[PDB]
Design a protein around this nucleic acid. Structure first.
Length: 168
RNA sequence: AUGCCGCGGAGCUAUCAUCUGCCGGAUAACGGCUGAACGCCUCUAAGCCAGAAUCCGUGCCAGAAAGCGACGAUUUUUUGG
Protein backbone atom coordinates (compact mmCIF):
# COMPACT_ATOMS: atom_id res chain seq x y z
CA UNK A 1 0.00 0.00 0.00
CA UNK A 2 1.89 3.02 -1.34
CA UNK A 3 0.60 6.43 -2.43
CA UNK A 4 2.82 9.16 -3.86
CA UNK A 5 2.52 12.75 -2.67
CA UNK A 6 1.32 15.42 -5.14
CA UNK A 7 3.42 18.42 -6.07
CA UNK A 8 2.87 21.58 -4.02
CA UNK A 9 1.12 19.89 -1.08
CA UNK A 10 2.82 19.66 2.33
CA UNK A 11 1.51 16.66 4.29
CA UNK A 12 3.12 15.98 7.67
CA UNK A 13 2.65 13.49 10.51
CA UNK A 14 2.31 14.99 14.01
CA UNK A 15 0.71 12.59 16.52
CA UNK A 16 -1.52 11.27 13.71
CA UNK A 17 -2.65 14.80 12.82
CA UNK A 18 -2.63 15.67 9.12
CA UNK A 19 -2.48 19.36 8.14
CA UNK A 20 -2.84 19.10 4.36
CA UNK A 21 -1.96 22.47 2.84
CA UNK A 22 -2.30 24.04 -0.58
CA UNK A 23 -2.20 27.41 -2.35
CA UNK A 24 -6.02 27.36 -2.51
CA UNK A 25 -6.90 26.04 0.95
CA UNK A 26 -5.95 24.09 4.06
CA UNK A 27 -7.60 21.02 5.58
CA UNK A 28 -6.98 19.18 8.85
CA UNK A 29 -7.92 15.78 10.27
CA UNK A 30 -7.21 13.69 13.37
CA UNK A 31 -6.43 9.97 13.13
CA UNK A 32 -6.77 8.64 16.67
CA UNK A 33 -8.31 5.44 15.27
CA UNK A 34 -5.39 3.61 13.59
CA UNK A 35 -2.46 1.73 15.13
CA UNK A 36 -0.35 1.64 11.95
CA UNK A 37 3.02 3.38 11.86
CA UNK A 38 3.41 6.21 9.33
CA UNK A 39 6.74 6.86 7.61
CA UNK A 40 7.95 9.34 4.99
CA UNK A 41 10.66 8.67 2.41
CA UNK A 42 10.84 12.30 1.26
CA UNK A 43 8.64 11.54 -1.77
CA UNK A 44 6.03 9.01 -0.56
CA UNK A 45 4.20 8.15 2.67
CA UNK A 46 4.17 4.52 3.79
CA UNK A 47 1.97 2.55 6.19
CA UNK A 48 3.78 -0.11 8.24
CA UNK A 49 2.34 -2.90 10.40
CA UNK A 50 3.91 -5.94 12.09
CA UNK A 51 1.56 -8.90 12.62
CA UNK A 52 -1.31 -6.96 14.18
CA UNK A 53 -4.95 -7.83 14.64
CA UNK A 54 -7.34 -8.51 11.78
CA UNK A 55 -8.96 -5.09 12.32
CA UNK A 56 -5.68 -3.56 11.10
CA UNK A 57 -6.48 -4.91 7.62
CA UNK A 58 -9.50 -2.60 7.48
CA UNK A 59 -7.53 0.13 9.26
CA UNK A 60 -4.97 0.28 6.44
CA UNK A 61 -7.68 0.67 3.79
CA UNK A 62 -9.54 3.32 5.81
CA UNK A 63 -6.34 5.31 6.33
CA UNK A 64 -5.51 5.02 2.63
CA UNK A 65 -9.03 6.11 1.67
CA UNK A 66 -9.13 9.14 3.97
CA UNK A 67 -5.64 10.22 2.92
CA UNK A 68 -6.82 9.96 -0.69
CA UNK A 69 -9.88 12.05 0.19
CA UNK A 70 -7.62 14.73 1.68
CA UNK A 71 -5.33 14.59 -1.37
CA UNK A 72 -8.18 15.10 -3.83
CA UNK A 73 -9.85 17.68 -1.58
CA UNK A 74 -6.87 20.00 -1.18
CA UNK A 75 -6.58 20.49 -4.96
CA UNK A 76 -9.97 19.68 -6.50
CA UNK A 77 -13.49 20.40 -5.24
CA UNK A 78 -16.61 18.62 -4.01
CA UNK A 79 -19.45 20.26 -5.95
CA UNK A 80 -22.83 18.99 -4.73
CA UNK A 81 -25.90 19.29 -6.97
CA UNK A 82 -29.17 19.41 -5.02
CA UNK A 83 -32.31 18.90 -7.10
CA UNK A 84 -35.80 20.03 -6.09
CA UNK A 85 -38.86 18.06 -7.23
CA UNK A 86 -42.48 19.01 -6.54
CA UNK A 87 -46.21 23.70 -4.44
CA UNK A 88 -43.38 26.09 -5.29
CA UNK A 89 -39.98 26.03 -3.59
CA UNK A 90 -37.38 28.74 -3.08
CA UNK A 91 -34.17 29.48 -1.17
CA UNK A 92 -33.59 33.21 -0.64
CA UNK A 93 -30.89 34.03 1.92
CA UNK A 94 -27.38 35.43 2.33
CA UNK A 95 -24.17 34.42 4.03
CA UNK A 96 -23.56 30.92 5.36
CA UNK A 97 -27.13 30.56 6.68
CA UNK A 98 -29.56 28.85 4.28
CA UNK A 99 -33.32 29.29 4.70
CA UNK A 100 -35.97 27.14 3.00
CA UNK A 101 -39.57 28.30 2.56
CA UNK A 102 -42.90 26.81 1.45
CA UNK A 103 -42.30 23.11 2.12
CA UNK A 104 -45.49 21.14 1.39
CA UNK A 105 -47.52 24.32 1.83
CA UNK A 106 -46.12 25.06 5.29
CA UNK A 107 -45.46 28.56 6.61
CA UNK A 108 -42.57 27.99 9.05
CA UNK A 109 -39.36 29.76 8.03
CA UNK A 110 -37.08 26.97 9.21
CA UNK A 111 -33.40 27.89 9.06
CA UNK A 112 -30.26 25.79 8.57
CA UNK A 113 -26.72 26.46 9.78
CA UNK A 114 -24.03 25.22 7.40
CA UNK A 115 -20.94 23.44 8.67
CA UNK A 116 -17.63 25.35 8.80
CA UNK A 117 -15.76 25.52 5.51
CA UNK A 118 -18.93 25.17 3.39
CA UNK A 119 -19.99 28.03 1.09
CA UNK A 120 -23.07 27.34 -1.03
CA UNK A 121 -22.79 29.16 -4.35
CA UNK A 122 -26.63 29.36 -4.54
CA UNK A 123 -26.33 29.92 -8.29
CA UNK A 124 -29.56 29.68 -10.30
CA UNK A 125 -28.08 28.47 -13.59
CA UNK A 126 -30.33 25.38 -13.61
CA UNK A 127 -33.95 25.47 -12.45
CA UNK A 128 -34.52 24.07 -8.94
CA UNK A 129 -30.82 23.24 -8.58
CA UNK A 130 -28.45 24.25 -5.78
CA UNK A 131 -24.64 24.05 -5.95
CA UNK A 132 -22.90 23.39 -2.62
CA UNK A 133 -19.13 23.83 -2.29
CA UNK A 134 -16.90 22.59 0.51
CA UNK A 135 -13.24 21.62 0.76
CA UNK A 136 -13.85 19.11 3.57
CA UNK A 137 -15.43 15.99 2.06
CA UNK A 138 -16.71 14.76 5.43
CA UNK A 139 -18.21 18.14 6.36
CA UNK A 140 -19.84 18.73 2.97
CA UNK A 141 -21.28 15.19 2.94
CA UNK A 142 -22.67 15.66 6.45
CA UNK A 143 -24.13 19.02 5.44
CA UNK A 144 -25.77 17.53 2.33
CA UNK A 145 -27.20 14.66 4.39
CA UNK A 146 -28.53 17.15 6.95
CA UNK A 147 -30.21 19.21 4.22
CA UNK A 148 -31.94 16.11 2.86
CA UNK A 149 -33.05 14.95 6.32
CA UNK A 150 -34.38 18.38 7.35
CA UNK A 151 -37.21 18.16 4.79
CA UNK A 152 -39.02 15.10 6.16
CA UNK A 153 -42.46 13.64 5.45
CA UNK A 154 -45.24 12.88 7.94
CA UNK A 155 -48.63 11.26 7.26
CA UNK A 156 -48.12 10.64 3.55
CA UNK A 157 -44.40 13.85 -4.02
CA UNK A 158 -41.04 14.57 -2.42
CA UNK A 159 -37.51 15.88 -2.81
CA UNK A 160 -34.55 13.52 -3.23
CA UNK A 161 -30.79 13.80 -3.77
CA UNK A 162 -28.89 14.07 -7.05
CA UNK A 163 -25.39 13.45 -8.43
CA UNK A 164 -22.22 15.41 -7.64
CA UNK A 165 -19.75 17.52 -9.60
CA UNK A 166 -16.20 18.87 -9.58
CA UNK A 167 -14.60 22.25 -8.85
CA UNK A 168 -10.98 23.41 -9.15
C1' A B 1 -76.91 29.96 78.95
C1' U B 2 -75.56 34.90 71.97
C1' G B 3 -84.03 35.82 72.88
C1' C B 4 -85.73 36.39 67.44
C1' C B 5 -85.62 39.11 62.57
C1' G B 6 -83.45 42.65 58.38
C1' C B 7 -79.28 45.12 56.86
C1' G B 8 -74.49 45.08 58.40
C1' G B 9 -68.50 47.80 57.80
C1' A B 10 -63.53 45.31 59.18
C1' G B 11 -61.35 40.53 59.06
C1' C B 12 -61.51 35.67 57.10
C1' U B 13 -62.88 32.97 52.95
C1' A B 14 -64.91 30.81 47.78
C1' U B 15 -62.52 26.18 40.32
C1' C B 16 -69.12 30.79 44.71
C1' A B 17 -64.14 35.74 43.36
C1' U B 18 -59.34 37.39 40.93
C1' C B 19 -53.99 36.92 39.34
C1' U B 20 -49.60 33.90 37.89
C1' G B 21 -47.41 29.16 36.38
C1' C B 22 -39.79 29.18 31.58
C1' C B 23 -35.85 27.29 28.48
C1' G B 24 -30.49 24.74 28.03
C1' G B 25 -27.75 20.29 27.78
C1' A B 26 -27.18 14.72 27.80
C1' U B 27 -29.82 10.94 25.84
C1' A B 28 -33.43 5.88 24.85
C1' A B 29 -36.00 3.99 20.50
C1' C B 30 -34.79 5.56 15.78
C1' G B 31 -32.91 8.15 11.34
C1' G B 32 -28.04 9.83 8.81
C1' C B 33 -22.60 11.25 7.42
C1' U B 34 -17.63 10.07 5.85
C1' G B 35 -16.13 5.04 5.11
C1' A B 36 -13.56 -0.01 5.17
C1' A B 37 -13.22 -5.04 6.31
C1' C B 38 -16.13 -9.18 3.22
C1' G B 39 -12.12 -4.80 -3.17
C1' C B 40 -19.52 -4.79 -3.97
C1' C B 41 -22.69 -3.34 -0.20
C1' U B 42 -24.47 -1.45 4.44
C1' C B 43 -26.36 4.36 10.17
C1' U B 44 -20.67 1.40 13.04
C1' A B 45 -16.03 -1.12 13.14
C1' A B 46 -13.37 4.81 15.18
C1' G B 47 -15.82 9.27 15.39
C1' C B 48 -19.45 13.13 14.33
C1' C B 49 -25.07 15.02 13.88
C1' A B 50 -30.39 14.83 14.63
C1' G B 51 -33.62 12.84 18.23
C1' A B 52 -39.26 11.62 23.59
C1' A B 53 -44.01 14.23 28.35
C1' U B 54 -37.05 10.45 29.55
C1' C B 55 -32.63 12.14 32.76
C1' C B 56 -29.59 16.26 34.45
C1' G B 57 -29.61 21.40 34.59
C1' U B 58 -31.80 27.41 34.29
C1' G B 59 -35.67 29.01 37.21
C1' C B 60 -38.75 28.31 42.19
C1' C B 61 -38.60 26.62 48.18
C1' A B 62 -35.31 25.68 52.45
C1' G B 63 -30.46 27.18 53.80
C1' A B 64 -25.06 23.21 56.67
C1' A B 65 -28.63 25.51 63.44
C1' A B 66 -20.39 22.38 63.99
C1' G B 67 -19.95 25.62 55.36
C1' C B 68 -18.26 30.48 53.91
C1' G B 69 -17.43 36.09 52.28
C1' A B 70 -17.71 41.55 52.62
C1' C B 71 -18.93 45.65 55.60
C1' G B 72 -20.24 48.93 60.35
C1' A B 73 -18.76 50.27 65.75
C1' U B 74 -15.38 48.05 69.03
C1' U B 75 -17.95 49.19 77.19
C1' U B 76 -15.01 56.47 78.26
C1' U B 77 -11.89 60.68 80.84
C1' U B 78 -15.71 56.04 87.23
C1' U B 79 -13.81 51.06 84.85
C1' G B 80 -12.49 47.91 81.12
C1' G B 81 -9.94 47.49 76.47
Amino acid sequence: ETLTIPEGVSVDIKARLVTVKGPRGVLKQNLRRVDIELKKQGNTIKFIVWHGSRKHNACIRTAYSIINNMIIGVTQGFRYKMRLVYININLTENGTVVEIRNFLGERITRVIKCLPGVTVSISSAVKDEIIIEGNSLENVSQSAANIKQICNVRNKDGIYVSERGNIE
